[PDB]
Amino acid sequence: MLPGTFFEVLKNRGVVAIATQGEDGPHLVNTWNSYLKVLDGNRIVVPVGGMHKTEANVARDERVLMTLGSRKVAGRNGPGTGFLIRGSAAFRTDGPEFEAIARFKWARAALVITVVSAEQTL
Amino acid sequence: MLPGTFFEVLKNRGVVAIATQGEDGPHLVNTWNSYLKVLDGNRIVVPVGGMHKTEANVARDERVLMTLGSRKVAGRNGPGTGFLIRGSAAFRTDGPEFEAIARFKWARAALVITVVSAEQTL
Ligand SMILES: Cc1cc2nc3c(=O)[nH]c(=O)nc-3n(C[C@H](O)[C@H](O)[C@H](O)COP(=O)(O)O)c2cc1C
Ligand SMILES: Cc1cc2nc3c(=O)[nH]c(=O)nc-3n(C[C@H](O)[C@H](O)[C@H](O)COP(=O)(O)O)c2cc1C
Ligand SMILES: [Cl-]
Numbered sequence: 553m554l555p556g557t558f559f560e561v562l563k564n565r566g567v568v569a570i571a572t573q574g575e576d577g578p579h580l581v582n583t584w585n586s587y588l589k590v591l592d593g594n595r596i597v598v599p600v601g602g603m604h605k606t607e608a609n610v611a612r613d614e615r616v617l618m619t620l621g622s623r624k625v626a627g628r629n630g631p632g633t634g635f636l637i638r639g640s641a642a643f644r645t646d647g648p649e650f651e652a653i654a655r656f657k658w659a660r661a662a663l664v665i666t667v668v669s670a671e672q673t674l
Numbered sequence: 675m676l677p678g679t680f681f682e683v684l685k686n687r688g689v690v691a692i693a694t695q696g697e698d699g700p701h702l703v704n705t706w707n708s709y710l711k712v713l714d715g716n717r718i719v720v721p722v723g724g725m726h727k728t729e730a731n732v733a734r735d736e737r738v739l740m741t742l743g744s745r746k747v748a749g750r751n752g753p754g755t756g757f758l759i760r761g762s763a764a765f766r767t768d769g770p771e772f773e774a775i776a777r778f779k780w781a782r783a784a785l786v787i788t789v790v791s792a793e794q795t796l
């Protein structure tokens with residue numbers, strides 16, 4: 553399951569990065585720390601406004617990488633911390649996963665990441 | 675050159691993300707906004723402590739992506755903005771490129787990103 557310090561990061565402001573595999577190289581997009589909705593112990597849901605290239609990539613290769621952190625959360629060896637998340641992604645336009653982020657009226661979909669690993673990298 | 679909004683983001687707290695092409699898929703690592711040093715119109719330097727997998731990737735494929743942002747900097751549609759940087763990476767252990775981040779006593783190298791494009795994505 554996702555660790556306690558990860559939830560501490562989610563209580564603080566920051567830029568989340570999401571990497572996917574494209575045809576000619578990686579792609580990299582963003583969301584905000586506060587926009588992530590955790591379901592169960594292994595699902596993270598992100599509201600999707602754009603992410604057209606990201607969605608195309610996920611459709612061909614479900615594997616994604618996600619990073620996030622905060623200067624304001626104590627890490628393993630000093631001030632500040634962050635995480636590398638590895639997981640499989642899918643997009644949903646309806647159902648409970650979309651409803652989890654439906655408060656964002658600009659959302660055309662939900663990006664659902666099923667987390668396989670969470671590594672505290674700082 | 676890099677736009678003024680980019681420099682304003684650098685003056686604010688945040689997590690930077692750097693994506694490279696690995697053999698099996700993307701790799702994704704981090705630094706801090708305040709760690710970045712802009713050398714001229716199109717070079718950004720990052721202090722390297724770890725980044726061993728990242729360095730190996732860059733040796734195979736120099737192309738990199740970088741994202742950064744801040745809630746505290748104005749975007750197109752209100753508060754909050756960020757950037758996607760596309761460029762090529764090189765690692766240096768001496769010269770002005772290393773001297774630029776030498777204040778970090780833990781730095782084993784400098785990661786020099788030569789920016790091809792900087793897109794404001796919010
Ligand atoms: C700090 C930041 C937060 C962002 N938040 C979102 C978001 O929550 N959802 C979204 O779809 N795009 C968000 N964007 C824009 C995306 O990063 C991306 O540029 C856009 O969705 C287009 O994706 P694509 O290049 O895969 O087509 C954000 C950008 C930044 C810089
Ligand atoms: C918020 C944050 C800031 C980081 N800052 C640096 C940094 O400035 N330089 C560095 O080498 N690694 C930094 N790290 C660790 C790297 O992201 C990465 O995990 C480590 O360098 C190993 O890289 P590699 O997987 O390419 O071997 C930071 C991690 C986080 C979460
Ligand atoms: Cl946030």
Ligand SMILES: [Cl-]
Nearest residue numbers: 687688707708
């Ligand atoms: Cl910072």
